[PDB]
Design a protein around this ligand. Sequence first.
Ligand code: MG
Ligand code: MG
Ligand code: ZN
Ligand code: ZN
Lengths: 67, 98, 55, 170
Amino acid sequence: YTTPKKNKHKRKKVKLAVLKYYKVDENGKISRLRRECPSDECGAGVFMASHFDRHYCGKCCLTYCFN
Amino acid sequence: MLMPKKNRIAIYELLFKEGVMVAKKDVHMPKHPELADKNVPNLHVMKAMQSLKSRGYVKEQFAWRHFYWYLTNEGIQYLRDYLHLPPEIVPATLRRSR
Amino acid sequence: GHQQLYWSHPRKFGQGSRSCRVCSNRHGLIRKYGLNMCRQCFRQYAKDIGFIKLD
Amino acid sequence: AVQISKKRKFVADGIFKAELNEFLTRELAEDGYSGVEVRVTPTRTEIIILATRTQNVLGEKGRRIRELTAVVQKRFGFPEGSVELYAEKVATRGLCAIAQAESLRYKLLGGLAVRRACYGVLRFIMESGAKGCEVVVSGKLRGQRAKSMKFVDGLMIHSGDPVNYYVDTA
RNA sequence: UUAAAGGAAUUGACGGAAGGGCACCACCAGGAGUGGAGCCUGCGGCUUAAUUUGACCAACACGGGAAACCUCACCCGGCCCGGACACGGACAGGAUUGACAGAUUGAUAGCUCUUUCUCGAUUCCGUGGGUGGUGGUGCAUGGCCGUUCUUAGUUGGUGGAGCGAUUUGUCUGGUUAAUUCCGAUAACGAACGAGACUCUGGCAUGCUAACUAGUUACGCGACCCCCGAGCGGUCGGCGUCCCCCAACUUCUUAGAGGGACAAGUGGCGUUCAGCCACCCGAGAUUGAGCAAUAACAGGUCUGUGAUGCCCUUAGAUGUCCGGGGCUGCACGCGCGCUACACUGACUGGCUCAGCGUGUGCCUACCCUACGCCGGCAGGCGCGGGUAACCCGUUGAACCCCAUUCGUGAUGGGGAUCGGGGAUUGCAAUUAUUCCCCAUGAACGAGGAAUUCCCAGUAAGUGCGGGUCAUAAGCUUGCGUUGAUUAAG
Ligand SMILES: [Mg+2]
Ligand SMILES: [Mg+2]
Ligand SMILES: [Zn+2]
Ligand SMILES: [Zn+2]
């Protein structure tokens, strides 16, 4: 009847409105900025994560070492 | 529900090759027996046919523990558009036995 | 959801898994001869089963 | 696979027999259902309805059998080509009690006076060549407290075994 | 001041009013007891975060309710949406899923958070509208069931009587378990219930038929044997539908028909119904089912996609998960188990059953032979059985025979409690059960009161279904042993 502790909210996402994951020089240049995932499926496809140091394959949940 | 696009066409294609599908009232079964091949839980089988009633396309009876469903003709002209089928393909409803 | 532990308690041995095929109850059901009907449920269909009384 | 014992053969077919009797009550109630009767063979098995309005169970070139052949087939484990249905008219529509109990259901849904409606079906059985019949209508009639009105006519037994086949209840 | 007070008749109900009948849910005559003791289990009470609850002859081993969790409502917490559709918005220049790591939790719940990859119109949001509910209301109901109610009772038609409610039919009397019949008669003819009926039990050396039942005979094998024979004695040792290397149905399992009707014979009775005796006979009342009219403010919305109305609907009474409770105890009550011993308890011999159940669509896990380990529960190897095919010829217990004990709270009784060993399971703590050693409590036949029962009955004694992963002190069935009292 009271609910004092306030379960605070649901999950609303981060809402970052830019992709921009391919830097370009010299009038057109293909260059990655995030590593690709080393799974059997998505070589040079969906990225691997770019943390402050570590990398993580987001779709199939494999991880690289904390380095 | 959450409506994955591979499993909806997986259940619609059998719900249009015959006019019936025979799910049983238990959500905690991860394997529909008559599909059995695209790892559908029959949550997707329930919550599709909920939506088909609320547009008035399907019909159901709630047996002992089974749901039965039937194709209204406004459902057939809905499934021939959503499965993108040409207007000669009809189910086993109209005349497939003589 | 979060399917790893939604339905994670083992419905196995015991009356957390036996249910009435006909009525959907878990109390008093008769698992003799593979009936699995609710006992209250059993009286209705017992003439349709082929179970006569004394007469 | 391996076959199960003769005790649990005979409760499996009865609970087969009890299950489709409950569905085909729910479907064909508005079309005068009045029972089924089964034949198991080591072939195509043949299931016959005993409907009164066999016109309504037939679809336009028989649709509402062929989907009702399938919902039995796609539930009870019948492969493609082992089960069929037939619609058959019961003789003396007004003599089996399952038939017109559903008739005076759908007479009450028309908004009739319950006393006027029950007489006409009481008259219908007794002029159809019966030995006796009675109808008990029980529920919330005109009044806040519920009450029951019975409309017995003719003569009717109550006890012994011959009230197993001289009567039918609904 | 007040809308009745009254008069006469009718139907019920009641009468510490008569009269006739009737019942072991009544008594007598009795038996076994219950009530006293310990404990098992339901209920009230108290206590509690919660001890979820429905019911007070016709509640209280009852919800087939023997709850470790699940069940599961209740309590402490924590996720999830499984909020269909309809409309607007959000909406490719940035709607929505999922998720490694860490402070973050009870929790390898992305629960949230810090950070960042990933999903492809799927959804998300507002507004209406569904929907779910072991949420309310059984005094809004259906259905089912209990009961008044195991007793004989109930209703029309048409006539007769009355203004009429009504009544006669439906009765003086005899008689019956019985409105059962006989008769009497403004009633006549009917209907329901009763009865018949169905199931069951007892009898058929007559009929039908049996390698999934058997006998008997005959072969064979073994064994005893004055003495040493054997058409001798024993054998659930083997073979005789295995393609005749025998017949048959007594025993066994059925199926059909038979049989018993108060028939026969005395006695009583209006010589009416029928009763009481006997003879023959297996049987001269086997046992249960269904079971009317009219009703109950009986119970059940927590059994049900039976259901009205209300409540609640996402910080949800939905649902899932982790723990806890439903077992908590100064007490009171109701079913019930074991006892209080010598008509016994031990210890060892010995011989006898019947009803039945057994591997599952989901659904995992069945009944267990035999062998080998274990002092015991149990542990393995290996079979068989979907069953008159195997467990199993179900070597059940009491009883029976010998042993020990001697009127002592004793070897009666086995509560309580410590230590150990195993099994079931995701988990055994608030002990699941089982096993072993040890511990050895009241209890000496139970006041008032009160219960069930009269023939295979009471009672003793075990056995099997249900529940069931583990499991019966409960229930519903079985056989065994078997009466004392009574025909009122
Ligand atoms: Mg219910
Ligand atoms: Mg003594
Ligand atoms: Zn890959
Ligand atoms: Zn409420």
